[PDB]
Design an enzyme around this catalytic site. Structure first.
Site, PDB file in Angstrom:
ATOM      1  N   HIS A 244       0.844  -1.179   0.000  1.00 12.57           N
ATOM      2  CA  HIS A 244       0.000   0.000   0.000  1.00 12.57           C
ATOM      3  C   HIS A 244       0.879   1.227   0.000  1.00 12.57           C
ATOM      4  O   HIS A 244       2.096   1.135   0.119  1.00 12.57           O
ATOM      5  CB  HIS A 244      -0.925   0.024   1.216  1.00 12.57           C
ATOM      6  CG  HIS A 244      -0.206  -0.067   2.518  1.00 12.57           C
ATOM      7  ND1 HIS A 244       0.168  -1.269   3.073  1.00 12.57           N
ATOM      8  CD2 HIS A 244       0.228   0.892   3.368  1.00 12.57           C
ATOM      9  CE1 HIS A 244       0.800  -1.049   4.211  1.00 12.57           C
ATOM     10  NE2 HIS A 244       0.849   0.253   4.413  1.00 12.57           N
TER      11      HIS A 244
ATOM     12  N   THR B  14       0.449   2.366  11.519  1.00  7.11           N
ATOM     13  CA  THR B  14      -0.984   2.600  11.719  1.00  7.11           C
ATOM     14  C   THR B  14      -1.405   1.575  12.755  1.00  7.11           C
ATOM     15  O   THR B  14      -0.816   0.501  12.828  1.00  7.11           O
ATOM     16  CB  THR B  14      -1.819   2.318  10.451  1.00  7.11           C
ATOM     17  OG1 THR B  14      -1.995   0.907  10.306  1.00  7.11           O
ATOM     18  CG2 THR B  14      -1.131   2.844   9.209  1.00  7.11           C
TER      19      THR B  14
ATOM     20  N   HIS C 209       4.842   0.577   0.726  1.00  2.00           N
ATOM     21  CA  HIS C 209       5.249  -0.377   1.752  1.00  2.00           C
ATOM     22  C   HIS C 209       4.786  -1.756   1.333  1.00  2.00           C
ATOM     23  O   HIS C 209       3.585  -1.998   1.241  1.00  2.00           O
ATOM     24  CB  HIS C 209       4.580  -0.072   3.082  1.00  2.00           C
ATOM     25  CG  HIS C 209       5.042   1.188   3.739  1.00  2.00           C
ATOM     26  ND1 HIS C 209       4.278   1.839   4.679  1.00  2.00           N
ATOM     27  CD2 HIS C 209       6.200   1.883   3.655  1.00  2.00           C
ATOM     28  CE1 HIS C 209       4.940   2.878   5.150  1.00  2.00           C
ATOM     29  NE2 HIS C 209       6.114   2.926   4.546  1.00  2.00           N
TER      30      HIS C 209
HETATM   31  N1  LIG Z   1       1.981   0.963   7.262  1.00  2.08           N
HETATM   32  S1  LIG Z   1       2.652  -0.456   7.683  1.00  2.08           S
HETATM   33  O1  LIG Z   1       3.263  -1.069   6.518  1.00  2.08           O
HETATM   34  O2  LIG Z   1       3.451  -0.220   8.850  1.00  2.08           O
HETATM   35  C1  LIG Z   1       1.228  -1.443   8.122  1.00  2.08           C
HETATM   36  C2  LIG Z   1       0.064  -0.871   8.624  1.00  2.08           C
HETATM   37  C3  LIG Z   1      -0.993  -1.701   9.013  1.00  2.08           C
HETATM   38  C4  LIG Z   1      -0.920  -3.088   8.879  1.00  2.08           C
HETATM   39  N2  LIG Z   1      -2.085  -3.867   9.137  1.00  2.08           N
HETATM   40  C5  LIG Z   1      -2.209  -4.657  10.355  1.00  2.08           C
HETATM   41  C6  LIG Z   1      -3.615  -5.271  10.268  1.00  2.08           C
HETATM   42  C7  LIG Z   1      -4.171  -4.883   8.885  1.00  2.08           C
HETATM   43  C8  LIG Z   1      -3.109  -3.994   8.288  1.00  2.08           C
HETATM   44  O3  LIG Z   1      -3.229  -3.464   7.175  1.00  2.08           O
HETATM   45  C9  LIG Z   1       0.310  -3.666   8.513  1.00  2.08           C
HETATM   46  N3  LIG Z   1       0.571  -4.999   8.620  1.00  2.08           N
HETATM   47  O4  LIG Z   1       0.310  -5.716   7.670  1.00  2.08           O
HETATM   48  O5  LIG Z   1       1.060  -5.391   9.662  1.00  2.08           O
HETATM   49  C10 LIG Z   1       1.324  -2.838   8.040  1.00  2.08           C
HETATM   50 ZN   LIG Z   2       2.244   1.741   5.345  1.00  2.85          ZN
END
Ligand SMILES: NS(=O)(=O)c1ccc(N2CCCC2=O)c([N+](=O)[O-])c1
Ligand SMILES: [Zn+2]
Ligand SMILES: [Hg+2]
Length: 258
Positions: free
Chosen positions: A92, A197, A117
């Site tokens: 994303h 986030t 990311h």
């Molecule tokens: N912005 S990051 O890349 O730090 C990031 C931000 C959030 C998430 N999560 C956690 C639950 C759903 C989701 O999208 C993750 N992740 O997959 O752990 C990554």
């Molecule tokens: Zn991110």
């Protein structure tokens, strides 16, 4: 109410529902290029996306994620400061309302237009939900985006944004090749951090690539036409979905170059 990036639920309010926001290894951070230590014991990054299987693109109300089929060792990331294999679960972006802000990680107090990311999880943990419960459970590859020349590989992403304009909407998005989003060089800065986030779990090994990718003004613009809101609700454009840099505290950012 619940989290977001507005004046009343923004980054400065996350510590009330998730006390870990004021943690010891929070991301993003400002990368000081002159204080980052060159480590020659760091191996080259190994991105093997040739068997990637994209499945869907979704607007979750905080940004749009492009999910991959992670049931097999298809799209993996190994090497670098990592031990073992990590499967790409999704990627994303985090952009701004103006070309001078949008990236979460800053290089020398400098902010870029956005930041890609590509989220990965350690396969020695079985599934994603078990990885978020360990200190070395995720490896997010950070790639900055600057405004300049268009990025062909990012165009198939831009044209499907009309169908996921609102929260909770999705769309079949197969055959996307994430390799067309990678810059020429794989030089990077690694450091132990967390999710940017909520839940803000401190489970990430951050690999921020030194080299940015350029995207046309027209490509970043079409990111700003998405909405935070669900259908039938007052329109709130999806812009500035980035978290401010956090204190580095008891951490050291290493580099794979000099
Ligand atoms: N912005 S990051 O890349 O730090 C990031 C931000 C959030 C998430 N999560 C956690 C639950 C759903 C989701 O999208 C993750 N992740 O997959 O752990 C990554
Ligand atoms: Zn991110
Ligand atoms: Hg963790």
């Amino acid at each position: 109410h619940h989290w977001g990036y507005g004046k009343h639920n923004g980054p400065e309010h996350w510590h009330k529902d998730f006390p870990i926001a004021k943690g010891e290894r929070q991301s993003p951070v400002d990368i000081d290029t002159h204080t980052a230590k060159y480590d020659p014991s760091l191996k080259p990054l190994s991105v093997s996306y040739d068997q990637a299987t994209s499945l869907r693109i979704l607007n979750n109300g905080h940004a749009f994620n492009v999910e991959f089929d992670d049931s097999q060792d298809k799209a993996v990331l190994k090497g670098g400061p990592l031990d073992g294999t990590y499967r790409l679960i999704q990627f994303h972006f985090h952009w701004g309302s103006l070309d001078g802000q949008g990236s979460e990680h800053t290089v020398d107090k400098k902010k870029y237009a956005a930041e890609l990311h590509l989220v990965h999880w350690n396969t020695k943990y079985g599934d994603f939900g078990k990885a978020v419960q360990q200190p070395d459970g995720l490896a997010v590859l950070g790639i900055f985006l600057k405004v300049g020349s268009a990025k062909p590989g990012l165009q198939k992403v831009v044209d499907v944004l009309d169908s996921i304009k609102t929260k909770g909407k999705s769309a079949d998005f197969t055959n996307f090749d994430p390799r067309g989003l990678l810059p020429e060089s794989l030089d990077y800065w690694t450091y132990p951090g967390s999710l940017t986030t909520p839940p803000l779990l401190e489970c990430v090994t951050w690999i921020v690539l030194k080299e940015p990718i350029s995207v046309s003004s027209e490509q970043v613009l079409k990111f700003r036409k998405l909405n935070f809101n669900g259908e039938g609700e007052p329109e709130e454009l999806m812009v500035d979905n980035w978290r401010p840099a956090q204190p580095l505290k008891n951490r050291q950012i290493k580099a794979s170059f000099k």
